[PDB]
């Protein structure tokens, strides 16, 4: 705790209307995307939304890292914050910024001192200041969107934007590549209509542009659209249990229990874990060629692991590998389902959304079940929340596996994350009431 | 602009046309000056006067005596003159919690006499003033509804009768007044 | 729309024409009563202003202007009390209550004086045919 | 085997969206998604020749 | 390094697909693509020509895209047509021609001048307005007038017009006129007087005064003042009907009457039912029009404007059967929209079914869903108001302990006027033959609208009777409004 | 402390300065 005079945007004293909020989101988003397209001057990434060689090389990594560290130290119960005061909250919010800025300082210094830009002073200081200004701008923009001028957070918004941009680029890329046979578009609809116009052989060009074993095609577009619509339908699933108040009588409402109970993190943790264990198996098999235990735990060849645990846990790309070995397919399915289920259970247990915590919240607020007693709220939540969370996690896993096997334009996790971010905005606009 | 008299010490705005708030301020300051001229002590106390109160009481009793003699014409003049003197020759720095109740006590008698005589509009105006100045009693709404019915205003009469019943619903006169109002309004529309 | 400027005008007139001494005290009492009335008005209107502002039906600058008037009224009352002490020594502990009473008294007097003009507007609105003696002749 | 039973029980007790509500849902979400996607696509496309000419 | 199109072989296809991706869906969507109103016809039959002229005065993209697609496809069809070679589809002169600095100067212009200036203009425009829909200066003037408003001064129509004459939106329309000019035009409009040359401004300001009066009413309810709100509603009625507020006004709002005859001849008729008390020919003889074909119009207008009447009024709280301290109840009104020609039907004839509330969780969670299923109100009969307006009922509640408004006014628009249709004409007042025992009289055919108002404030923590006063006035006619009191029996 | 319009103005100024520096360097290399 200390006194700091740092640039911070003040929250609006009154509620911002929906139209102005939408306009501010749009303009700040345009600024964020334009900032990621400009290269530096003196010069001679997929998950954290960053690109090399531009003013957005650092991106939102300092903000996300500071937020993660603060959430972790809060979960370990080391800050001892009390919601009874409106000063320690501001202290936490300024701690956010004072750690983010020094992290930017460190990352910019290390990248400018070790990066491939070159050891030779005015150019060096200018390149440092460029990244400094870019990072302060993006942090200030996220703070602005989070203060109330935007529909929601900035990090999730920008992640969804990059997801949608990659999806649209996988289909409408005007870039061409000429490899022996001729020039072909790297987009799906583009090359589709191109071959439909120039080839003048419909029966052949149709199947040639619909399969495209080498490049994205129209079949992948149809598959990703179908999965998109299916996920959209799977978002309205919810259990509304009837609830009533006891302190202030006459307040009748419902408590919704959505299907996708978690915030889509457990699948991310599962993917990170399996990627780490796959790379570790690869490294260890590279270090030890032959061993009674290393040959059993994993073998790598033509890279791709084969006849090993890393071979069993690796994801399926297309239907050929699916019909090849049903044992590997079924064990992979069972593994990715069980892991996601237990991860969802652990996440609802750790994130304070346990049925015990919900029962305590009801007891504090005074809310009770409509047609049940008050000494049965926890016993009823125990019969609802765990099963709902587990089944939601299993469904998320099934959607991810289906997207990975059908070979859509993007990973299913990205699609569900973007749809969740947008559905949050839609539900907020519907509940508040606006055009 | 504004002119200042020499002998009378009254301030008057010599402008061709003057605003309303400015004129009210001019009159207030002139009243204060005329009061300070009469009041001798430099450190005047909020304690009210006594001789003025005696004159007011004497005028009020002389007006009330005409009720025993049953002269409702000169009694109204006497009570109106008493109220006028109480409103005019009384210093504004006198006690408010003592100047207001005497005004109310005289105004109630004036209202009763004005209603008994046959003047209804002045009675309604005085009733509305006494109600808006901070006195709410069932003895006021009855006369208000009676007057509004006497001058053929049924909507306001019904509203006032309902507001009176919303405070003392145990009245036996307010209910008859409401019944008469409902009958008159049903004939007024049907 | 105030009597604050009128007191200064009276002071400038006295500085030249040698007018009486009691008129300045009267104008001082008047400005003090007006300041007390405005302070009470603001104190009783602040919650409604804040409610309208929170409801988002008044704007953004009017709230700041209102909060500014809150302290300008206090500054004006402080200046008035300082001028009162300058005009008469040891006349502060009584000036406050005198103004507090003359405020209500002048408000009541204006409210009562308004009835003579209020009596004719209802006549014009309801088309009464009132002869002499205030009776109705239909 | 109780897992699937409780799952289908929860599903039967759930509240599936009807056609009229799902229509507005998909309309709003598709409008938002297309709006952000065209913005991303245009921003990524326009800055290629600009980056060539400038640098 | 990229390889741009140097022989015009790839960018035509890219432009063609980019254009089809837009024209196609437009073509698809283009190929793809309850309340009786009896005044919609008779309004244009009495409107003056000077207002008709004012109201009158004050796809090709698909075709051009299709012809462009045809041109592009013809151009492509007329064309002749190991390591990787990446390339772009954009043309070569676009980066390497003589117009290379042109693109960057246009881009920097669009980024530095067009975007910030337009954003700032939009921001200053959306900031100068209030959430209600009026300018900030107008609301500031309203508040500044209401705060230094002497309670001794009575509110009239002239005072509210004087307040309206200072609206900042009136200066933006015509920066030449003054507030006194606006007051004169409004007085000429209300008194049905001609301005001579500024009629196009008078009509515009009259049409704009609507939202101004609604904002003034909102602010007056915010300051907890009832007389100003009543004056606002009365002035809105007077403006919409173009008539000065008089005791005998429900008959002067009619389309074709003569004041110099009606006022001097009769002196006892003041309402519409009292007018309907006389026969069909005596009404014409009194109103002095003596034209049957023209008397039919006024007789059809006077029997089709809505009058209200209460059937059941009480406090309701969702999920309980009584009112408890610190509970959040609402007001439920069971009104009967009737005309001045129908007699009074007893409350006992109501079958008690339409007065009850359904006892279900989905119905008690949001009790306004059943109210929001009522049809809209028909168009109003305002031959002098410039635009076309629908009816509106402003319901506002006050307290009875002091007489102060305690919440913002609610404006309802959904209501069923089925009881005003011409099918139920047998139920007349002049028959006096007990039409309740009629062969066509069916209590199940008369529809009973409902009105629900959220209270916005909880019940007091005490236990006892607390009286309130709800006021439901019209906004277009001078009909019989609702002025009733109700007390909440807080019992715990 | 900082208004949203200030954030937008500063961001556009930063971008404009970067692109201006780039184009100045480009035209300097082209001419000299």
Domain locations in chain B?
1-190
- Name the residue in chain E with its Cα closest to that of B187: E274
How many angstroms away from the CA of B163 is the closest CA of chain C?
A: 21
How many beta-carbon pairs below 8 A join chains A and D?
95
Strand duo E310-316 + E464-474: pairing:
unpaired
Compute the distance between CA of residue C84 and CA of residue E421 in angstroms, rounded to an integer: 74
Residues from chain E contacting residue A178 (CB–CB below 8 Å)? 84-85, 87
Asked if E314 and E420 sit in the same domain, the reply is yes
A41 touches chain F (CB under 8 A): yes
Other CB atoms within 10 A of residue A186 CB: 20
C-alpha dist (Å) from residue E237 to A132, E188, E207, E397, E473 = 63, 16, 13, 19, 10
Nearest to D39 by CA among B59, E384, B160, A36: A36
Asked if E428 contacts E436 with a C-beta cutoff of 8 angstroms, the reply is no
Q: Please indicate whether, in this complex, the C-beta atoms of B126 and C112 are within 8 angstroms of each other.
A: no
Instruction: For Cα atoms A149, A154, A157, give the angle at the middle one, nearest 5 degrees.
Output: 110
Q: Is the dihedral of CA B166, B169, B174, B179 positive or negative?
A: positive
What is the rounded distance in angstroms from the CA atom of residue E199 to the CA atom of residue E309?
Answer: 39
Q: Please state, in angstroms and rounded to a whole number, the distance separating the CA atoms of residues C99 and C93.
A: 11
Closest to A407 in 3D by CA, of A314, A326, A319, A304: A319
A48-63 exposure pattern, b = at least 16 Cβ within 10 A, e = fewer:
ebbeeebbbbbbbbbb
Interface of C with B (CB under 8 A): 1, 3, 6, 9-10, 13, 17, 19-20, 22-23, 25-27, 29-30, 88, 91, 94, 97-98, 101-102, 104-106, 108-112, 115, 118-119, 122-123, 126, 128, 130, 133-136
Instruction: State the distance between the two ends of chain F, measured CA to CA, in whole angstroms.
Output: 45
Is the Cβ–Cβ distance between B26 and B12 less than 8 Å? yes
Query: What DSSP designation does E314 have?
Result: E
State yes or no: chains B and C have 3 or more CB pairs below 8 A: yes
Which of these, C77, B105, A31, lies nearest to F9 by C-alpha position?
A31
The terminus-to-terminus CA distance of chain E in angstroms comes to 82
C-chain residues near B36 (CB < 8 A) = 22, 25-26
Q: What would the DSSP string read from start to end of A232-289?
A: HHTTS-EEEEEEE-SSSTT-EEEEEEESS-S-SHHHHHHHHHHHHHHHHHHHHHHH-S
Nominal resolution in Å?
4.1
Residues A284 and A270: beta-carbon distance below 8 Å: no
Shortest alpha-carbon distance between residue D47 and chain E (Å): 10
Q: Which domain holds residue E270?
A: 136-301
Q: How many domains does chain D have?
A: 1
How far apart are the CA of E417 and the nearest CA of chain D, in angstroms? 29
- Alpha carbon of C42: minimum distance to chain E alpha carbons (Å): 9
Cβ-nearest to D10 among A172, A174, A387:
A387
Q: Whose CA is closest to E187, among E212, E156, E154? A: E156
Tell if the CB–CB gap between A176 and E87 is shorter than 8 Å.
yes
- The number of residues in chain D equals 55
Interface test with C, best of E129, E154, E227, E268 (most C CBs within 10 A): E154
Cα separation, B2 vs E50, in Å, equals 51
* Local structure of residue E376 (DSSP, 8 states): B
Best E96, E103, E109, E116 residue to mutate vs chain F (most F CBs within 10 Å): E116
Six token digits for residue A16: 């911002």
* A38/D47 Cβ within 8 A: yes
Residue of E437, E438, E491 lying closest to E462 (CA atoms): E491
User: What CA–CA distances, in Å, run from A112 to A101, A115, A134, E318?
Assistant: 16, 5, 15, 65
Experimental approach was cryo-EM
> CB under 8 Å to B35, separation ≥6 — which residues?
B91, B92, B93
User: Distance (Å, rounded) from C-alpha A35 to C-alpha A42?
Assistant: 17
- Nearest residue of F to residue E121 by CA position? F5
Beta-carbon-side half-sphere exposure of residue E104 (alpha carbons within 13 Å): 22
d(CA E25, CA E4): 30
In 3-state terms, what secondary structure has residue D43? helix
A8 at interface of F, judged by CB pairs closer than 8 A = yes
A13 and chain C: CB distance < 8 Å anywhere?
Answer: yes
Q: How far apart are alpha carbons E379 and F20 in whole angstroms?
A: 60
In A87-208, which ranges are E strands?
176-178, 183-185
Residues A382, A385, A390, A396: what is their CA dihedral angle, to the nearest 10 degrees?
Answer: 180
The CA distance from B162 to the nearest CA of chain C, in Å, is 22
Q: Which residue of F has its CA nearest to E113?
A: F12
Of E360, E359, E355, nearest to E449 (Cα)?
E355
Range of the domain at C86: 1-138
Other CB atoms within 10 Å distance of the CB of residue E358: 9
Residues 6+ apart with CB under 8 A from C14: C23, C24
Query: Do residue E268 and residue E398 come from a single domain?
Result: no
Q: Which residues of D18-35 are buried (b: 16+ CB within 10 A; e: fewer)?
A: eeeebeebbebbeebbee
E390 and E476 inside one domain = yes
A141 close to F (CB below 8 A): yes
Is E274 in CB contact (< 8 Å) with chain B? yes
Q: Label the pairing between strands E482-490 and E464-474.
A: antiparallel
User: What angle in degrees, to the nearest 10, is found between the helix axes of C95-113 and B96-117?
Assistant: 10
The helix or strand, by DSSP H or E, that contains position E145, with its residue range, turns out to be helix E136-147
Query: How many distinct structural domains can be found in chain C?
Result: 1
Rg (CA), chain D: 22
In order, the DSSP letters of E395-439 are EEEEESSS--B-SPPEEE-B---GGGSTT--S--STT-S-GGG-T
Q: CB neighbours (10 Å) of residue E78?
A: 7
Residues of the domain holding D52: 1-55
Are the CB atoms for B113 and B82 separated by under 8 Å? no
Of E273, E469, E483, the CB nearest to B189: E273
Positive or negative torsion for Cα E448, E453, E458, E461: negative
How far CA F22 is from CA of A36, D50, D52, E96, F19, in Å, comes to 16, 11, 12, 18, 5
CA distances for C33 relative to B11, C1, C105, E26, E227, angstroms: 19, 14, 10, 71, 27
| 8 Å CB contact of C58 and E143 | yes
CA dihedral A45, A50, A51, A53 (to 10 degrees): -120
Question: Which token pair is F9?
Answer: 């103005």
Contact D50 E107 (CB under 8 A): yes
Round to whole Å and give the CA distance between E175 and B67: 65
> Which pair of tokens denotes residue C54?
């929170």
Find chain C residues with C-beta within 8 A of E246's C-beta. 127
Rounded Cα–Cα distance for residues E219 and E144 (Å): 11
Q: Are E289 and E461 in contact (CB under 8 A)?
A: no
User: Nearest 10 degrees: CA dihedral of B96, B97, B99, B105?
Assistant: 150
Shortest alpha-carbon distance between residue A118 and chain E (Å)? 22
The two structure tokens encoding residue E133:
């829909």
E79, burial (CB in 10 Å: exposed 0-12, middle 13-18, buried 19+): exposed
Q: Which residue has the tokens 């009720």?
A: B67
Q: How far apart are CA E166 and CA E159, in angstroms?
A: 12
Mutate to test the interface with E, among B128, B167, B183, B189 (most CBs of E within 10 A): B189
The 3-state DSSP class for residue F3 equals coil
Residue C96: which residues within 8 A CB-CB, separation 6 or more?
C81
Q: Which of E104, E112, E123 sits opposite F12 (nearest CB)?
A: E112
Smallest CA–CA distance, residue F32 to chain E, in Å, is: 18
The residues, any chain, with a CB within 8 Å of residue B163's CB and separated by 6 or more, are: B141, E400, E403, E469, E485
The position carrying tokens 């009486």 is C20
Q: After which residues is chain B broken (C to N over 2.5 A)?
A: none
User: In the complex, which subunits touch A with 3 or more CB pairs below 8 angstroms?
Assistant: C, D, E, F
Domain count, chain E: 2
Among the residues of C88-136, which ranges form H helices? 95-113, 115-126
E29: enclosing H helix or E strand = helix E11-32
In this complex, the residue of C45, C48, C58 whose CB is nearest that of residue E139 is C58
Contacts made by residues A182-189, CB under 8 angstroms, sequence distance 24+:
A183/E9, A183/E10, A183/E87, A184/A215, A185/E10, A185/E13, A185/E14, A185/E89, A186/A215, A186/A216, A187/A216, A188/A212, A188/A215, A188/A216, A188/A217, A188/A218, A188/A220, A188/A221, A188/A409, A189/A218, A189/A221, A189/E17, A189/E21
Q: How many C-beta atoms surround the C-beta of residue B77 within 10 A?
A: 11
Which candidate, E453, E464, E471, E472, places its Cα nearest to that of E489? Answer: E464
Quote the tokens at residue B93: 């720095």
- Answer for the pair E134, E221: CB distance below 8 angstroms, yes or no: no
- Are residues E265 and E385 located together in one domain of the fold? no
């Amino acid at each position: 705790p200390f006194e700091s005079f740092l640039p911070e945007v003040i929250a609006p004293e009154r509620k911002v209307p929906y139209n102005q909020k939408l306009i501010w989101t749009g303009v700040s988003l345009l600024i964020f995307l334009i900032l990621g397209q400009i290269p530096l001057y003196g010069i001679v990434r997929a998950m954290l939304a960053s690109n090399r060689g531009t003013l957005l090389e650092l991106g939102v990594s300092p903000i996300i890292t500071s937020s993660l560290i603060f959430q972790f130290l809060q979960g370990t119960q080391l800050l001892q914050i009390r919601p009874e005061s409106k000063q320690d909250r501001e202290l936490f919010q300024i701690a956010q910024k004072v750690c983010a800025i020094i992290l930017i300082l460190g990352q910019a210094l290390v990248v400018v001192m070790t990066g491939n830009y070159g050891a030779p002073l005015p150019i060096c200081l200018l390149l440092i200041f460029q990244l400094m200004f870019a990072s302060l701008i993006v942090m200030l923009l996220d703070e602005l969107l989070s203060k109330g001028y935007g529909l929601g957070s900035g990090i999730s918004l920008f992640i969804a934007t990059n997801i949608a941009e990659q999806i649209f680029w996988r289909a409408f890329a005007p870039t061409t590549v000429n490899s022996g046979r001729g020039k072909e578009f790297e987009g799906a609809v583009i090359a589709f209509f191109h071959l439909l116009a120039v080839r003048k052989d419909k029966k052949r060009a149709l199947v040639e542009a619909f399969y495209r074993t080498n490049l994205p095609n129209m079949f992948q577009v149809l598959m990703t659209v179908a999965i998109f619509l299916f996920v959209l339908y799977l978002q309205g699933f919810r259990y509304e249990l009837p609830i009533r108040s006891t302190k202030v009588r006459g307040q009748i409402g419902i408590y919704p229990i959505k299907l996708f109970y978690t915030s889509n993190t457990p699948i991310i943790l599962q993917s990170a874990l399996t990627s780490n264990i796959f790379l570790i198996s690869q490294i260890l098999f590279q270090k030890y060629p032959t061993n009674p235990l290393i040959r059993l735990i994993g073998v790598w060849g033509i890279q791709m692991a084969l006849s090993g645990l890393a071979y069993y846990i690796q994801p399926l790309m297309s239907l050929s590998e699916a019909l090849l070995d049903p044992i590997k397919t079924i064990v992979y399915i069972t593994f990715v389902l069980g892991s996601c289920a237990v991860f969802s259970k652990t996440w609802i247990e750790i994130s304070g959304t346990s049925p015990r915590d919900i029962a305590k919240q009801f007891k504090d607020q005074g809310m009770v079940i409509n047609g049940k007693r008050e000494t049965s709220i926890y016993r009823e939540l125990k019969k609802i929340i765990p099963t709902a969370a587990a089944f939601g996690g299993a469904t998320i896993g099934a959607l991810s596996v289906g997207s990975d096997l059908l070979g859509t334009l993007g990973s299913g996790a990205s699609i569900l994350l973007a749809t969740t971010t947008i559905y949050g905005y839609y539900e907020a606009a519907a509940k508040e009431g606006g055009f | 602009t504004l002119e200042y008299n020499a002998n009378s010490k009254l301030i008057t705005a010599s402008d061709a046309v003057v605003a309303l708030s400015t004129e009210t301020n001019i009159d207030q300051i002139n009243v204060l000056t005329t009061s300070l001229i009469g009041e001798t002590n430099p450190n005047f106390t909020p304690q009210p006067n006594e001789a003025l109160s005696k004159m007011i009481k004497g005028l009020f009793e002389s007006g009330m005596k005409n009720l025993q003699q049953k002269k409702l014409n000169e009694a109204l003049k006497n009570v109106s003159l008493a109220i006028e003197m109480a409103q005019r020759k009384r210093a504004p720095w006198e006690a408010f919690a003592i100047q207001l109740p005497e005004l109310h006590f005289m105004l109630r008698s004036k209202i009763d006499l004005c209603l008994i005589l046959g003047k209804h509009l002045e009675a309604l105006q005085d009733l509305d003033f006494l109600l808006g100045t901070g006195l709410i009693q069932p003895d006021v709404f009855v006369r208000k509804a009676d007057c509004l019915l006497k001058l053929r205003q049924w909507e306001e009469a019904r509203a006032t009768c309902e507001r009176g019943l919303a405070l003392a619903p145990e009245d036996m006169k307010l209910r008859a007044l409401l019944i008469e109002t409902a009958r008159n309004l049903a004939e007024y529309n049907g | 729309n105030d009597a604050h400027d009128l007191y200064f005008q009276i002071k400038e007139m006295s500085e030249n024409e040698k007018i009486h001494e009691k008129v300045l005290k009267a104008a001082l009492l008047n400005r003090g009563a007006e300041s007390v009335r405005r302070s009470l008005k603001l104190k009783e209107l602040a919650p409604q202003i804040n409610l309208l502002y929170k409801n988002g039906s008044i704007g953004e600058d009017y709230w700041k202007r209102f909060e500014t008037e809150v302290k300008l009224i206090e500054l004006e009352f402080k200046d008035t009390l300082q001028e009162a002490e300058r005009l008469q020594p040891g006349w502060v502990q009584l000036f406050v209550m005198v103004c507090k009473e003359i405020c209500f008294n002048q408000a009541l007097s204006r409210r009562y004086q308004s009835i003579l003009k209020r009596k004719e507007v209802c006549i014009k609105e309801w088309e009464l045919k009132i002869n002499n003696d205030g009776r109705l002749v239909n | 085997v109780e897992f699937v039973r409780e799952g289908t029980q929860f599903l039967a007790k759930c509240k599936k969206p009807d056609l009229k509500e799902y229509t507005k849902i998909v309309k709003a979400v598709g409008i938002g998604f297309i709006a952000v996607g065209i913005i991303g696509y245009a921003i990524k496309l326009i800055h290629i020749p600009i980056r060539y000419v400038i640098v | 390094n990229y390889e741009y199109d140097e022989a015009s072989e790839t960018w035509p296809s890219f432009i063609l697909t980019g254009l089809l991706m837009v024209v196609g869906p437009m073509t698809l969507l283009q190929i793809y693509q309850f309340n009786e109103e009896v005044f919609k016809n008779l309004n244009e039959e009495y409107t003056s020509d000077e207002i008709k002229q004012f109201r009158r005065k004050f796809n090709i993209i698909i075709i051009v895209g299709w012809i462009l697609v045809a041109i592009l496809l013809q151009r492509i069809n007329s064309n002749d047509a190991q390591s990787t070679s990446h390339g772009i589809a954009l043309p070569r002169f676009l980066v390497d021609g003589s117009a290379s600095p042109l693109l960057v100067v246009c881009y920097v212009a669009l980024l530095g001048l067009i975007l910030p200036y337009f954003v700032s203009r939009w921001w200053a425009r959306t900031q100068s307005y209030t959430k209600k829909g009026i300018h900030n200066v107008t609301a500031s003037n309203f508040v500044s007038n209401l705060v230094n408003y002497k309670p001794s001064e009575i509110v009239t129509t002239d005072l509210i017009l004087h307040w309206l004459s200072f609206a900042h939106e009136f200066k933006q329309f015509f920066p030449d006129l003054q507030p006194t000019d606006f007051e004169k035009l409004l007085q000429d409009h209300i008194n049905r007087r001609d301005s001579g040359k500024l009629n196009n401004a008078k009509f515009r300001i009259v049409a704009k005064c609507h939202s101004l009066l609604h904002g003034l009413l909102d602010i007056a309810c915010g300051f907890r003042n009832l007389d100003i709100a009543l004056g606002a509603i009365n002035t809105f009625k007077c403006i919409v009907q173009a008539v000065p507020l008089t005791p005998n006004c429900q008959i002067l709002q009619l389309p074709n009457v003569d004041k110099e005859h009606f006022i001097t001849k009769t002196g006892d008729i003041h309402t519409l039912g009292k007018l309907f008390t006389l026969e069909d020919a005596k009404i014409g003889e009194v109103l002095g029009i003596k034209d049957q074909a023209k008397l039919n119009e006024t007789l059809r207008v006077a029997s089709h404007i809505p009058n209200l009447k209460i059937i059941k009024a009480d406090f309701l709280v969702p999920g309980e059967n009584q009112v408890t301290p610190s509970s959040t109840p609402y007001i439920s009104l069971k009104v009967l929209v009737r005309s001045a020609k129908q007699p009074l039907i007893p409350t006992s004839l109501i079958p008690e079914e339409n007065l009850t509330e359904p006892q279900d969780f989905e119905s008690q969670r949001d009790p306004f869903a059943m109210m929001s299923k009522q049809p809209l109100v028909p168009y109003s009969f305002a031959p002098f108001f410039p635009t076309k307006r629908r009816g509106s009922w402003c319901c506002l509640v006050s307290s009875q302990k002091d007489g102060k408004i305690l919440q913002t006014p609610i404006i309802i628009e959904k209501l069923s006027y089925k009881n005003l249709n011409d099918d139920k004409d047998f139920f007349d007042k002049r028959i006096k033959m007990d039409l309740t025992k009629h062969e066509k009289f069916d209590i199940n055919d008369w529809e009973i609208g409902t009105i629900k108002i959220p209270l916005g404030q909880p019940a007091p923590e005490t236990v006892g009777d607390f009286f309130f006063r709800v006021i439901v006035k019209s906004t277009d006619y001078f009909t019989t409004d609702l002025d009733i009191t109700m007390n909440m029996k807080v019992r715990d | 402390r900082v208004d949203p319009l200030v954030v937008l103005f500063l961001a556009v100024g930063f971008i404009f300065s970067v692109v201006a520096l780039h184009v100045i360097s480009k035209v300097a290399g082209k001419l000299f």
